[PDB]
Every structure is written in structure tokens, then in C-alpha cells.
Amino acid sequence: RGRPYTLSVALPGSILDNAQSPELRTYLAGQIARACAIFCVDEIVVFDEEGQACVQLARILQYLECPQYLRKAFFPKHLQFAGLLNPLDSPHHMRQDEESEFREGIVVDRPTRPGHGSFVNCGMKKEVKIDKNLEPGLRVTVRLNQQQDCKTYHGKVVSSQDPRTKAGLYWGYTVRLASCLSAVFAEAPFQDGYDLTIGTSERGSDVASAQLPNFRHALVVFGGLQGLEAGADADPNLEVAEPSVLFDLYVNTCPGQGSRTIRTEEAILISLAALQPGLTQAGAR
Amino acid sequence: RGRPYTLSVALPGSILDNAQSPELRTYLAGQIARACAIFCVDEIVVFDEEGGQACVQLARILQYLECPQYLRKAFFPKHQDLQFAGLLNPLDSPHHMRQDEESEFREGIVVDRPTRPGHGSFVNCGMKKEVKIDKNLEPGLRVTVRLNQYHGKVVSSQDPRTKAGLYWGYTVRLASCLSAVFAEAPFQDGYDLTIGTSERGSDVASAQLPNFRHALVVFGGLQGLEAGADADPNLEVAEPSVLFDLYVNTCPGQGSRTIRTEEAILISLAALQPGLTQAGAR
Ligand SMILES: Nc1ncnc2c1ncn2[C@@H]1O[C@H](CSCC[C@H](N)C(=O)O)[C@@H](O)[C@H]1O
Numbered sequence: 425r426g427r428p429y430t431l432s433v434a435l436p437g438s439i440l441d442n443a444q445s446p447e448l449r450t451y452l453a454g455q456i457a458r459a460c461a462i463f464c465v466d467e468i469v470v471f472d473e474e475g476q477a478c479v480q481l482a483r484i485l486q487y488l489e490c491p492q493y494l495r496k497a498f499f500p501k502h503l504q505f506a507g508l509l510n511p512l513d514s515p516h517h518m519r520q521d522e523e524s525e526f527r528e529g530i531v532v533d534r535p536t537r538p539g540h541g542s543f544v545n546c547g548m549k550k551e552v553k554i555d556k557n558l559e560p561g562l563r564v565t566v567r568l569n570q571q572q573d574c575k576t577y578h579g580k581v582v583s584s585q586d587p588r589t590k591a592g593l594y595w596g597y598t599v600r601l602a603s604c605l606s607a608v609f610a611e612a613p614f615q616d617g618y619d620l621t622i623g624t625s626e627r628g629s630d631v632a633s634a635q636l637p638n639f640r641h642a643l644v645v646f647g648g649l650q651g652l653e654a655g656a657d658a659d660p661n662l663e664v665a666e667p668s669v670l671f672d673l674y675v676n677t678c679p680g681q682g683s684r685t686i687r688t689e690e691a692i693l694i695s696l697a698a699l700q701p702g703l704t705q706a707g708a709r
Numbered sequence: 710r711g712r713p714y715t716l717s718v719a720l721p722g723s724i725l726d727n728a729q730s731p732e733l734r735t736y737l738a739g740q741i742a743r744a745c746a747i748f749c750v751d752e753i754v755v756f757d758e759e760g761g762q763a764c765v766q767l768a769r770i771l772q773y774l775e776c777p778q779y780l781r782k783a784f785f786p787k788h789q790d791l792q793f794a795g796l797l798n799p800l801d802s803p804h805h806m807r808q809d810e811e812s813e814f815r816e817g818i819v820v821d822r823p824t825r826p827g828h829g830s831f832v833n834c835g836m837k838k839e840v841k842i843d844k845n846l847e848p849g850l851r852v853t854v855r856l857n858q859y860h861g862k863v864v865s866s867q868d869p870r871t872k873a874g875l876y877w878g879y880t881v882r883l884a885s886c887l888s889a890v891f892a893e894a895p896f897q898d899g900y901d902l903t904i905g906t907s908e909r910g911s912d913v914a915s916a917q918l919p920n921f922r923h924a925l926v927v928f929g930g931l932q933g934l935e936a937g938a939d940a941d942p943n944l945e946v947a948e949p950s951v952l953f954d955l956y957v958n959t960c961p962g963q964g965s966r967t968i969r970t971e972e973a974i975l976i977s978l979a980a981l982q983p984g985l986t987q988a989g990a991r
């Protein structure tokens with residue numbers, strides 16, 4: 425039932441600068457968030473391929489990922505427009521009425537006696553009581569007890585990776601800022617790093633011909649208006665050459681494209697669709 | 710060399726009504742045009758899923774974007790539906806070339822220049838000079854011209870594709886209902902492969918596409934293909950799958966509750982691309 429692999433996507437913040445209005449800038453950020461949610465992307469890495477655009481993108485991505493009942497707690501907000509344009513509707517974004525094995529919550533600032541556990545706002549009709557003693561303001565994943573007229577529901581804090589790794593549920597993404605293209609690779613949140621890296625380009629090899637190797641943590645990387653060339657050339661930590669040398673695979677995911685250029689946000693949907701069968705097979709236990 | 714098959718996409722004009730501003734409405738139309746151009750779609754069918762304004766606005770934006778830039782003044786007077794065209798992303802298709810670019814074919818408009826029966830016509834093909842052709846044609850007609858390898862020959866508009874393998878844009882068709890998508894196909898034998906899309910469809914990974922000549926991929930709007938099927942008095946079906954050769958979910962295990970039509974076109978045409986390419990080949 426569980427999914428043992430992760431999928432990360434990297435792209436440059438600069439793509440917001442190419443948007444033609446403030447409204448379209450915000451919509452574009454939403455397009456990115458939605459593409460990643462649709463394809464059950466676990467991490468979005470926003471890199472500086474050269475600042476403002478990177479930070480604005482990352483913040484919108486985080487806001488959209490956050491369950492609605494937690495947003496006012498984590499975001500000074502009103503971002504509200506971005507959320508209206510492109511809601512994720514992901515499995516952790518359930519309504520108060522819906523039954524769920526897991527829920528995201530925030531530990532509430534309640535005066536408690538040491539050792540007596542904590543109270544969590546999981547967006548339910550009642551607070552959830554947990555045995556772990558945690559600081560108010562932390563975001564946690566709670567597994568609700570199967571057996572529950574008490575003042576609270578009861579649950580236990582579990583790893584935020586449990587819904588995916590144990591139940592096969594998509595549970596949103598984390599957003600990482602990277603100061604350059606080398607940092608996309610170097611500052612992976614996995615000890616082992618990304619063991620399968622895939623770059624994308626019209627100059628890549630045919631995606632249809634590639635055999636994806638078995639993997640645990642995949643990374644798919646996208647460029648902006650000037651391709652992965654911009655990021656590669658700007659970073660002194662990286663080999664000076666065409667970008668294909670920086671990846672395990674470097675693929676064209678739309679053979680015979682009928683437009684001269686495919687935009688980053690279009691390419692993420694096309695590429696993740698093209699790679700989905702392969703990633704599913706190669707990532708399986 | 711040539712590509713012997715066509716690919717048509719159908720969707721409801723009603724999706725423009727779900728856009729949250731006038732500017733986003735125009736932007737969304739452009740998203741449809743670009744998704745179709747990227748995938749070398751030859752025809753976009755805009756249908757009325759209620760069984761008029763959204764459909765006409767979508768159709769007009771699609772046609773405007775398809776038209777080579779040097780012919781837009783001739784074919785597109787200023788209109789309210791195109792007031793936000795500046796926010797559109799150009800298609801940058803093969804027939805959208807600059808004046809300096811060498812090309813085997815160019816689109817043109819026959820122009821009013823002195824001629825006599827039998828002495829042919831002149832065509833504005835966007836080149837430095839108007840192009841002389843041997844065929845007598847009325848001014849104002851759009852034609853495909855094969856340049857002599859400033860003289861050319863008017864050829865079938867399907868030659869760039871069928872002979873040279875070039876994507877050459879799309880035609881736009883309005884359909885008054887879902888059944889008309891099928892019934893008013895511009896091909897004599899109709900669409901011989903029809904593919905509907907839905908989260909309730911069978912897994913696209915198991916689909917086996919039969920050899921085909923004219924493929925059709927159909928998308929619903931906010932309420933799915935159920936809406937158009939239900940609203941059309943020419944159909945009396947329980948659910949939409951029986952209208953199609955294949956009825957497919959193209960994004961297994963999707964991580965959002967709903968995939969919007971414009972997202973789904975990109976995902977589904979990507980998912981089907983290997984299959985379509987293989988099954989349509991000579
Ligand atoms: N055919 C294709 N296959 C895979 N990815 C593509 C693609 N076309 C565009 N992309 C993705 O979309 C991004 C923006 S398009 C970049 C265009 C640039 N002229 C260049 O030389 O690459 C690219 O960096 C790549 O990540």
C-alpha cells in the first residue's frame with residue numbers, strides 16, 4: 425500500500441519575472457503548485473539561476489500547500505487571491521466532516537502541566553489530545569485513534585512521511601529555496617541525496633527510449649526562459665559545459681513539439697506525465 | 710517523411726466561465742491554444758455543453774492565435790473578445806515564420822492586383838514581395854503556397870503535414886452539442902478513433918490504440934463529459950464512456966481532487982502521445 429520513493433521538482437524563481445501582470449504572476453505560481461500536487465510531488469525546490477521572484481514563488485507555493493484551517497496560524501496572509509485562483513485540493517486538505525486516518529494540525533498554546541501531553545488543532549469539531557509534550561505553534565501529522573462523548577479526540581503524532589510511506593497517500597510538498605543550481609543537488613533533505621536526477625530540455629534525449637533505474641529519491645529539474653544553461657553557467661561550483669553532464673538523464677519529453685518553445689509551467693505537466701509510468705515502476709519496492 | 714494522420718481535440722467553451730477575471734478568461738483561451746499547438750493538434754472543436762458567448766469568445770481567440778501574424782490585419786478586425794490579446798502567449802508554430810526565414814511553404818492571402826483570366830494571381834505570403842501564382846483566385850482567400858525551389862504554387866493546406874511532416878496549425882470548429890462533435894467531423898469517414906477523458910475512465914497505461922487515420926480526444930468542463938452528454942437530446946446514454954472507442958484516466962493516483970480542463974489537455978496529450986504516434990504511423 426505504501427509508496428517508498430520521493431519525487432522532487434526544481435525550477436527557477438525567475439519565471440515569475442516573465443509574467444505580464446501582477447495577477448498573472450500570482451496565477452503562474454498557482455500553476456506550478458497545482459502541477460506538482462497533481463503529480464504527487466513531495467518537494468519543490470526553487471533556485472536562483474542568476475531573489476525577489478524566488479521568494480515570492482516559494483511563499484505562494486507554501487501558502488497553497490498549507491491546509492486551509494492552518495493558514496491564518498502560519499501566514500499573515502491576504503495570498504488569499506492565489507488560493508482562490510489555484511486551490512490544490514490535496515488529500516490533506518479535507519473538510520471538517522470528512523473521515524481520515526491522518527490529519528495535519530498545529531499544537532495549540534494551551535497552559536499544560538509538564539508530562540500531560542499536548543492539544544492539537546486538526547481542524548476537527550474537537551481538539552485532538554496527544555501524549556507527546558510539544559511546543560505550541562508546531563505543525564504535526566496526527567494519526568487519529570480508531571476507537572474514540574469525550575471533550576477531545578485522541579491521536580498520536582507520527583512522522584509526516586507516514587501517510588505516504590505507510591498508507592500510499594499524497595500528503596503535500598515541502599518547499600526549499602536554493603541559492604544556485606549546485607545547491608539544488610547539494611542541499612537535498614535526504615542524507616543520501618537524490619539518487620536519480622533528471623534534467624529537461626528540448627536538446628535532451630528522447631524520453632520514450634530511456635530506461636529509468638531503480639531509485640529512492642528522484643529529482644526532476646526545469647529551466648526558465650534561457651533553459652538550464654542559465655543556471656549551469658551562473659554557478660561556479662558546476663562543471664563548465666552543456667547541462668546534460670549535471671544529470672543522470674537529460675530528456676526531451678515532447679518529441680516533435682509544434683511550438684518553438686514550451687514554457688516552464690507547460691513543461692512540468694508534460695514532463696511529469698511523460699515520466700509518470702517510468703517513475704512509478706522504477707520507484708516501486 | 711509525411712504524417713498521414715490527424716489529431717483533433719474537443720472541449721466545451723463553458724470553461725471560460727470558470728475564469729476569475731476578464732484577463733484570466735483570455736489567458737485561459739490562450740492556454741488551450743498553446744496546449745493544442747505543442748501537441749500538433751490539427752483541429753480544435755469547441756462545443757456547447759448546455760446543448761453561446763463563451764464558445765464564440767474561445768473560438769475567436771483560438772483562430773486569432775493560429776493566424777500567422779502577417780495575415781492578422783487582413784483577417785481580424787478589432788473586437789471585444791480580443792481586447793486582452795496582449796496577455797496571450799504566441800503559438801510560435803512552423804507556419805509563423807519571420808519575413809527572412811526560408812520555408813518550403815507559406816500561408817498567404819490572395820490580393821487585388823491587376824490580372825486577366827488565365828494569368829493567375831498575386832498572394833501576400835509575408836515575404837518582401839507579393840508571390841505570383843498560376844491559379845486564378847478571388848482576393849481575400851487564405852491559401853497555402855509552395856515556393857518554387859517570387860513564384861509559387863497553391864497547394865492543399867494539408868500538404869505541409871502529409872508531405873513534409875510539418876505541423877501547420879489547426880482549424881477551429883464550433884459544435885452546437887456533444888453529438889455534433891462526432892456527427893459534423895470534417896472528414897468523410899468521421900473520426901475512426903475516439904478517446905474520451907475522465908477520472909472515471911480506465912487506466913491509460915492499459916489502453917491499446919488501434920491503427921487510425923483521424924483521432925479525436927474529447928475533454929469535459931467543470932462537471933465532466935456527463936454534462937454535455939446529459940444536456941444533448943440526440944444522446945440517451947447512462948454515462949459518457951459508451952460514446953467513445955476508449956475512455957481513459959490519464960493521471961493515475963492524481964494528487965488533486967480535480968484536474969482542470971486546460972491542465973488535463975497537457976497531461977492527456979502527453980500520456981497518449983507515444984500511442985498516437987505509433988498507431989497513426991503509415
Ligand atoms: N521538449 C522539451 N522537453 C523537456 N523539457 C522542456 C522541453 N521544452 C522546454 N522544456 C523545459 O522548459 C524549460 C523552459 S523552455 C527554455 C527554452 C530555452 N530556449 C532553451 O534553450 O532551453 C526548459 O528549460 C525545460 O526545463
Ligand SMILES: Nc1ncnc2c1ncn2[C@@H]1O[C@H](CSCC[C@H](N)C(=O)O)[C@@H](O)[C@H]1O
Pocket residue numbers: 906907908927928929930931932933934957958959960961963967968969970973977
Ligand atoms: N484523471 C483524469 N484523466 C483524464 N482526464 C481528466 C482527469 N481529470 C480531469 N480530466 C479531464 O478534465 C475535465 C475537467 S475535470 C471534470 C471533473 C468532474 N467533476 C468530473 O466528474 O469529471 C474532465 O471532463 C476530463 O476531460
